């Protein structure tokens, strides 16, 4: 059905990850995008080109939204058309540092809804996958979110984000303070949105939240969380929106809503807007 | 090497301990509280510690111990000159309870209050980190070397938020984080265990670790792994590392270490050599 696309997606993700996991051992030319901490390498760009070219060959009618393609001037507008939403390296800062959480993420949407997701954590060798109505898996093991409904026994994942604007940083850290002092059991950060979300899918964390991500950060992993039994929503507590720059990916609505209650929202430019 | 036999035995016991932990992590757990609702312990932490201490006491009856859960049970935390095994049976208990996949057994061995060898077994990953003073650091037999990065603005740091939930204290922790973050650095990561964070520094995958509120057992095994990989340990004041001070910067080099020390406001803590 789309099982053909998905099987293909899994092989491409694995191929891309081999490229990434080969490059990581090599000397790298770190380049900057929007800020001195917003990094990109030729590997990011090479992998995205490879993915888009391979998909274009097999599925010439399909649409793409790719992080580096957007950096090169393409639009981040999601139509109804089958659309591949790619983050060629989610965890570029980790990649640069050889910090061992580096993922290739592919989300596939039709009618603006994700139908399947693939996240390959290539240093770990963990292939996370999910298709709508068919469950979530890591290396074939079927995933289930945790059962925890008590925020004070929760373990959260988040990331401090790409902005270094003091007011923004202070707001991110204030939001972390409020959650931390609920209290919760802990907060962790492995340095990649897609892997943090996959950790929620496995049950090893109870929820992830972040503001400032993009559709390509969340498009592969969000369906892995929901097929593992979890939920997605905006940090505003509103419906999840791939283009809103904000997410809570949680084991369940109770924790998700409890988190949303503490998040001061930071104003963000949508991926679907100028 | 007089201490080499001790170290080889330590590796043995750490792997045994890791097998215990990595079995138990899959199963139902009884999660208990120590000093607060977020300071956790399980029967596995206690069982592993008892196993290690009883095993060491059998081979080295004259040796001393400082073990996290033994201290919880009332033993003294102060390091004497006598050969001392400093044990964290599970560093990453909160991770263990949640099945967050970083959980370590840590054993440091001190003589004359100086660490002579350290063993950290990261059992979910199957990674055995070891170092003997003057003999280098290894992971699964591969020699480790810290990163070469001397520019703080290109550095990746690891830290943890700690066990306190007192707003004042949390604010100082986060303020320290804000200052470093805004230097800026490339990022900060937290995998949930001081020993594993420090072993990430030893491998070069992070450039430096800092934290206040750890204990000697959190850092006794991994500190020499860092230094034998070429790195440095420093107090957050910029002064010499003090194993009983509850504070550490463990970095690839003195340039980054000192640059981090410059931004840290010290939080007040009971030392491990105080009551
Ligand atoms: Se991948 C993953 C993520 C969470 C828990 C377990 C796994 C995993 O690899 N499981 C597994 C896959 C294949 C064979 C044995 C075990
Ligand atoms: O596992 C590692 N190497 C390794 C590779 C092959 C055989 C034995 C060991 C390693 C690499 C980098 C950091 C830490 C480790 Se444990
Ligand atoms: Mn990326
Ligand atoms: Mn403890
Ligand atoms: Mn412990
Ligand atoms: Na990027
Ligand atoms: Na990303
Ligand atoms: Na680095
Ligand atoms: Na990141
Ligand atoms: Na509140
Ligand atoms: Na510990
Ligand atoms: Na949990
Ligand atoms: Na430089």
Residue numbers in the entry:
A (entry chain AAA): 4 to 277
B (entry chain BBB): 3 to 277
Original authors' sentences:
IMPase is a key enzyme in the intracellular phosphatidyl­inositol (PI) signalling pathway, whereby IMPase dephos­phorylates inositol 1-, 3- or 4-phosphate, collectively known as InsP1, to produce myo-inositol, also known as free inositol. Cleavage of InsP1 into myo-inositol by IMPase is required for the recycling of inositol for subsequent use in the PI signalling pathway. One enzyme inhibited by lithium is inositol monophos­phatase, which has led to rational drug design targeting IMPase as a strategy for developing novel therapies for bipolar disorder. One such IMPase inhibitor is ebselen [2-phenyl-1,2-benz­isoselenazol-3(2H)-one], an organoselenium compound which functions as a glutathione peroxidase mimic.
In this structure, ebselen is in an open-ring conformation, with the Se atom forming a selenosulfide bond to the sulfur group of Cys141, which is consistent with the known binding mechanism of ebselen. IMPase contains seven cysteine residues, amino acids 8, 24, 125, 141, 184, 201 and 218; of these residues, only Cys218 is near the active site. IMPase is a dimeric enzyme and in the crystal structure two adjacent dimers share four ebselen molecules, creating a tetramer with approximate 222 symmetry. The binding of ebselen to the Cys141 residue in each monomer does not lead to noticeable changes in conformation in the active site that would prevent the catalytic activity of IMPase. In the crystal structure presented in this publication, the active site in the tetramer is still accessible, suggesting that ebselen may function as an allosteric inhibitor or may block the binding of partner proteins. Previous research suggested that Cys218 is the primary reactive cysteine residue, which is supported by the reduced inhibition of C218A mutant IMPase by ebselen. However, whilst this structure clearly shows ebselen bound to Cys141 in each monomer of IMPase, our structure does not rule out the possibility that Cys218 could be modified in vivo. There is evidence that modulation of IMPase away from the active site and dimer interface can affect activity; synthetic peptides that disrupt IMPase–calbindin interactions prevent calbindin-mediated activation of IMPase and mediate antidepressant-like effects in mice. It is possible that ebselen interferes with accessory protein binding, possibly by formation of the tetramer seen in the crystal, to moderate the activity of IMPase in vivo.
